[PDB]
């Protein structure tokens, strides 16, 4: 009566039977823009059922020798669904997110992931020059739908050690107790609205801490999906198409 939970947004529910709990990020629900904050003087065009539903990304494989993966939000939705056709026409943007990571296993496997949400996530270059100087490419700072791999998971590509990285919102995926993790993030940004294509707010991270071990004979391909979904999103400021 506390494990089983069904989340239903829009027209696409998600049921699960071995969950743990639901984590709000910094204790505040995602809400609309009150009129002491808004600075645009044109009416925002908020849809309700078209762009508030769970979109499923592509599933990475988890092996013996894996390092990590990371995505950037809301970069990953700029090509799929109606939300990909309302972040190209409209200049401004404002939303929340509601993440979900499935990874199921048997009873004789072991291992544990770490699902976090890091606001304002900057990727840093990896070269010992002081001026030319190395810089990350465009296919690394905005990976797209797939999401690249970490090169150094111990320092998170930023010189921040992993052991201190529970100050962010997070849940564990411990493969003996649960098999799904859920974070609900409100809208954290300085200016009230935001551009939608350049300023990507935050970034999901999955880092396997205790690596996968299994005895001989079990199934060897354990995949990992993501299921995100916006909440209370509103747009504004129409123009022509720029991808």
């Amino acid at each position: 009566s506390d494990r089983v939970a069904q989340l239903t947004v829009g027209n696409s529910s998600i049921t699960t039977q071995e969950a743990a709990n639901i984590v709000l990020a910094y204790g505040e629900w995602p809400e609309y823009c009150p009129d002491t904050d808004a600075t645009a003087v044109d009416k925002p065009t908020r849809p309700d059922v078209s762009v508030n539903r769970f979109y499923t990304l592509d599933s990475k494989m988890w092996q013996e020798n894996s390092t990590g993966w990371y995505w950037k939000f809301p970069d990953v939705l700029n090509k799929t669904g109606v939300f990909g056709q309302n972040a190209q026409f409209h200049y401004l943007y404002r939303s929340g997110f509601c993440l979900h990571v499935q990874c199921n296993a048997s009873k004789f496997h072991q291992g544990a992931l770490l699902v976090a949400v890091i606001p304002e996530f900057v990727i840093a270059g990896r070269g010992s020059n002081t001026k030319e100087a190395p810089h990350p490419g465009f296919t690394t700072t905005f990976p797209g739908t797939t999401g690249a791999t970490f090169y150094d998971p111990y320092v998170l590509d930023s010189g921040v050690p992993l052991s201190q990285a529970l100050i962010y919102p997070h849940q564990w995926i411990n493969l003996r107790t649960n098999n799904c993790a859920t974070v609900i993030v409100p809208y954290i940004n300085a200016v009230p609205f935001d551009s939608a294509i350049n300023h990507s707010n935050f970034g999901l991270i999955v880092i396997p801490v205790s690596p996968l071990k299994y005895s001989s004979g079990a199934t060897t391909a354990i995949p990992i999906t993501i299921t995100i979904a916006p909440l209370n999103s509103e747009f504004g400021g129409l123009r022509q198409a720029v991808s």
């Binding site: 009150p34 004789f108 111990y154 052991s163 801490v209 205790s210 005895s215």
Partner: protein
Amino acid sequence: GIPAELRPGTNQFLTTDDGTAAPILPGFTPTPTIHIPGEVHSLLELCRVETILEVNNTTEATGLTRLLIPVSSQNKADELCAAFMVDPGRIGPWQSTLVGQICRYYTQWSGSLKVTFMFTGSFMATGKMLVAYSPPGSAQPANRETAMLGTHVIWDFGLQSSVSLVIPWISNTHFRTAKTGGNYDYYTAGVVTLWYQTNYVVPPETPGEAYIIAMGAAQDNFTLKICKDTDEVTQQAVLQ
């Protein structure tokens, strides 16, 4: 006008003092605030968040393997699994937590602590693990029948996966200067050995090593006193 003699203290520049100074822009109204979630008000809402210790800080482990303690099915009982100190502000395992990075900006900590363990093993494997703690004065304990004198919590694996030892505040002084050496060994605080209680029993065709992740935090009566300037910084240039 009014007669006013001066004092020592004239014409100095003390850094940590708060006085007024003449503004440069008369009649300035700043850009107004909006509601942004997750506001801090103190640095005691950042000492109460459990982060990951670095216990396996030995010669042969490198990388993500440093963060976790290994267990395995022993041949005998009574054996030892890991051991470390309680000194936020001494080199060792506490240097990679938020307590160990904030209690180096300050001197003279106080109050309790807590250590949370999490077991990342399989599902069908059980066991028990004593978790001891002993106040200072002697060396590291030898066998288990000596380390069951101090504070200890016997922990059993099951559907739950966490026990949280609360290391109490047993000290003569009201604070502890958070530095070690020869003359400052008067402010040390003892060892947190993990002992096997019985064994680690495993069914057939199941992996034969599990990994215990240790964590760490601070309790509710945690206070800090004197702001100093830290020592983990490194520079020899101007960052050109």
